[PDB]
Amino acid sequence: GMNNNMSLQDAEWYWGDISREEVNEKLRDTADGTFLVRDASTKMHGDYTLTLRKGGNNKSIKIFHRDGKYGFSDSLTFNSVVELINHYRNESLAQYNPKLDVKLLYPVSKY
């Protein structure tokens, strides 16, 4: 069973550029529970940062562009453009808690 696993383009929204068309429009059309990494400009707000709605409000776990850095906003500087997008925590019930959880079921596929 020779299975050659090229493990990127895994996340459903993944252009490199999804802003307003999902951040504002799927906030209104699917309500709450929707994973989407948002391409804002550098002097504006979160420049390709992780955004989702989770029981009403916005649970944004990465902050700003900063290379693309996995874990939390402290002293690391850099990591990836797949660990930040979807790896155990960034597209799962395991984002907050896998047994308790809230709302996270509608990732916006190529939009």
The Cβ of residue 11 has, within 10 Å, a number of other Cβ atoms equal to: 19
- Tokens 């050659």 appear where? 4
Query: Going from the N-terminus, what domains does the chain have, and what CATH number goes with each?
Result: 1-111 (3.30.505.10)
- Tokens 């996270």 appear where? 104
Distance (Å, whole) CA 31 – CA 108: 12
- What b/e string do you get for 76-90 counting C-beta neighbours within 10 Å, with b at 16 or more? eeeeeebbbbbbebb
Distance (Å, whole) CA 50 – CA 76: 17
Do 71 and 57 meet the contact criterion of CB atoms below 8 Å apart? no
Distance (Å, whole) CA 81 – CA 15: 12
